[PDB]
Subunit: 229 residues, 4 copies
């Protein structure tokens, strides 16, 4: 049933934004004991590992408009189901961002706009001061690579069952490399969710984190489909 | 035999409290080399991963009254076995908390009451100063999500064998997000165990960490059963 | 062939001491970027995960005299092969400790005696100042629990293939809890290897880390065999 | 088809250098939140875990001239395919190093030569001041051990599917031990890639990190083939 797959994609994407962004906003910078980028990166991949095992057998477990569209371009997913996944994914992420904003507001001094609310940005809004070109190349390469890993790990001849470990851990890796550059998107639903609550520059740069992750995912699906499969 | 399943749940829950709380009390804040929240979060999920692989095939490996009751509500576990699991779980956790208190007392300056002995709390007793509403929402969402992941990872059509990785790592993730908010419960046996030895406010707020994790687990079982399965 | 199993146990135990102790001596305290106890704990479990997958199908992959003897007591391993495993394990660990001492000496200021060379100790020689009773209880409980996890993860009805993940990660967990107490033994071959090169108090307390890990392993094998299996 | 296997080895090795070196150059030392050696070590192993699951079923997933040649020496891979793998691997790594250098240049003050651009070195160029002998022994032992783990984890009687976890995590472990000594090579393609852009001493010491990782891999393949298999 399409409706359960959509529900799976919705809950899945909530889990991803709530855990990934949640761990950044609530836990990364906690004084002395905070989890850092490494811990945020771990949380990211675990959201996908845990939900891909929980609901992958229902929707395919994309939880990411760049995954859905890259699987489309890779010949693994039908055109007709794409938009519904992307919508489910966005809604899921917004609901998680909203519950997170509520949780974060329960601590004195919380300020979504000034902290950035874990939004992805480049230039002045890159966590490490990286240029827009730096942001483009990193997001493109890692979106491509994420898709190449998803395609291959779910290949016919790939050992059955492990895809959720491969894919989720691939997202940890992605974050271990790129947080300093863009705060790591590779996911338009993820960038949209928190940008809405950040409410300023995150909305002005949001288009970047629709365009680049998607193109990158497309490229990754094409590489697998035409050169590897 | 019910007796071995109870024993499995008892040893399992001891392993969870001893490792999870043990790593927090003995190792989180160790000067210069201590493991932080990220390391506590890792320990948490590994207690469940390791025991779910060790004794999951005996009891189902709940190790958590919110898991048992959420599996009940999800239609995966019988009413008649619930109370015995919960009792086993509580006893297991108390024995671990007691052996831990003994281990911790062997270091000059240990003080269960003043340190909090890894107890879950909100408000004044949240590690990060988060309100009661912040604590409710986080514990509710993550208890629900823990149950959704348990249900899905053990679904008929979920690949056999991986559930312990999915579930245990889901608990790491849960801790990576919420330690700052409540010290992370999602488990009434876990909160009760150490609150007894903390012996003050942890006992006054303990009811919260029975009610919220259970309701949350219930909701998660209901979501899976009615919308996903 | 017994000879290959011994060789597997020997190489295995070298891998464990070289990686576990190696990461502590070379990397834990590296200024600013060092890996801490959490990273040492991760290295520990990965030595066992990686070798249990590499040579578990040859020897059973014990790499630990407390594992061999606890599997004996659990009815999973024959008396007649025990001593040969323990010998293989000790030799393996000593060779790793020797190559490590050589590697560590290649940096100005290295001093095995004064640093402790990653040796296990209690009292004055506990990393965190914990008493002998604290050391006994922690080592006993965690040795028992390690054995309970090994027995269960390799149970007939335990899903085939995952034991190396369960067991190796159980050792990470063990280290996440107890490094501050004893530097974490649960392994007489591991304690002997480096105590020889530390060459002072580590040799005076070594008996503790033969007796306690073994008794603990025995207890864990007995718990599984009589109450769980 | 040889061409796809080469492409798999090429993309694979790019993924390894881009993630491993990428995480070091972009994220290790990030102020306050940076990922450290432990996080770099995790990234390393995840590059191999993720690509071995994605393309292992295509090429065998070596991503490392020391792996290819050690599998040769172990009797697991034909002489005639070796050079093509090594070439693919080197090209892959250089392309990743180039895209990384471009990403890193987008931040004020980046200087590949002075930072070392994550190059492997010994002596004056060891991160921790370790001698050349220290560097030889560590790289030899860990290259050998990496190969022993690869051989065993892919043995006939090794449980099917887990090799990518065993091998990838073995690389994390390798890095947890040796970064301080050499920045961890065990991979000539990895050392060559960044040495080209470092452009000074990294090129003068590069031969070391061809010779030692290869000899070590050879030894590891020989140990398995003659003593364990
Ligand atoms: C699915 C929801 C996507 C939301 C995209 C909306 C883009 C908003 O656009 C932004 O609006 C803000 C006005 O409040 C301003 O801060 C910015 O100048 C403007 O670019
Ligand atoms: C699927 C639902 C969301 C679709 C993509 C949202 C793209 C938002 O794009 C944003 O639009 C603004 C225009 O108002 C511009 O001012 C911003 O610069 C741009 O980031
Ligand atoms: C899917 C979301 C829209 C993607 C359209 C691709 C081209 C967008 O192009 C960009 O739009 C920005 C404002 O939106 C401007 O600030 C940039 O100058 C413009 O280059
Ligand atoms: C299964 C065991 C559950 C124990 C729940 C008992 C609740 C105790 O209640 C508490 O008792 C303390 C008196 O010692 C006081 O600190 C508190 O004011 C009181 O709320
Ligand atoms: C299964 C065994 C334990 C059941 C749940 C214990 C709930 C304890 O609840 C506690 O009770 C006290 C009443 O004395 C109150 O004062 C505290 O505020 C409350 O946290
Ligand atoms: C299972 C444990 C009891 C849960 C009962 C749900 C309602 C409890 O309600 C709460 O009890 C606390 C004291 O116990 C009071 O401090 C709070 O004001 C009260 O709201
Ligand atoms: C398998 C190898 C086990 C070695 C155990 C030997 C116990 C050594 O015993 C120790 O010897 C040292 C003398 O050099 C002294 O530092 C100590 O006082 C003494 O207890
Ligand atoms: C299997 C090979 C090693 C067997 C166990 C070694 C036990 C060493 O035991 C050591 O012996 C010394 C006696 O000289 C005592 O002085 C020390 O206190 C004690 O730690
Ligand atoms: C297997 C290694 C020997 C274990 C024997 C168990 C009893 C050892 O007993 C201990 O031996 C130590 C010196 O060895 C003394 O310092 C202690 O006082 C003594 O209690
Ligand atoms: C596959 C590509 C391998 C490149 C190996 C080339 C070895 C370069 O050699 C180096 O060249 C530099 C001149 O630019 C100098 O810094 C060094 O003195 C010299 O050793
Ligand atoms: C497969 C393509 C690369 C082959 C190995 C490159 C080995 C480079 O070796 C380098 O060569 C230089 C000679 O110019 C010496 O000066 C350096 O000391 C040495 O590191
Ligand atoms: C595959 C790359 C070449 C390996 C050849 C093995 C012997 C190299 O030998 C070394 O070469 C270096 C310059 O290249 C010199 O600095 C050293 O003194 C020399 O020992």
């Amino acid at each position: 049933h399409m409706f359960r797959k959509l529900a799976a994609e919705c809950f899945g994407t909530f889990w991803l934004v709530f855990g990934g962004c949640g761990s950044a906003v609530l836990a990364a910078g906690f004084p002395a004991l905070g989890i850092g980028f490494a811990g945020v990166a771990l949380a990211w991949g675990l959201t996908v590992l845990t939900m891909a095992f929980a609901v992958g057998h229902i929707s395919g477990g994309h939880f990411n408009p760049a995954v859905t569209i890259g699987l489309w371009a890779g010949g693994r997913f039908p055109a007709k189901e794409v938009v519904g996944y992307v919508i489910a994914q966005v809604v899921g992420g917004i609901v998680a961002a909203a519950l997170l904003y509520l949780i974060a507001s329960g601590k004195t001094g919380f300020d979504a706009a000034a902290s950035g609310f874990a939004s992805n940005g480049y230039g002045e809004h890159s966590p490490g001061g990286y240029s827009m070109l730096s942001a483009l190349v990193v997001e493109l390469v890692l979106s491509a690579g994420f898709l190449l890993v998803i395609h291959g790990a779910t290949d016919k001849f790939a050992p059955a069952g492990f895809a959720p470990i491969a894919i989720g851990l691939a997202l940890t890796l992605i974050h271990l490399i790129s947080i300093p550059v863009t705060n790591t998107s590779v996911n338009p639903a993820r960038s949209t969710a928190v940008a809405i609550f950040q409410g300023g520059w995150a909305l002005e740069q949001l288009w970047f984190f629709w365009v680049v992750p998607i193109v990158g995912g497309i490229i990754g699906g094409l590489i697998y489909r035409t050169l590897l499969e």
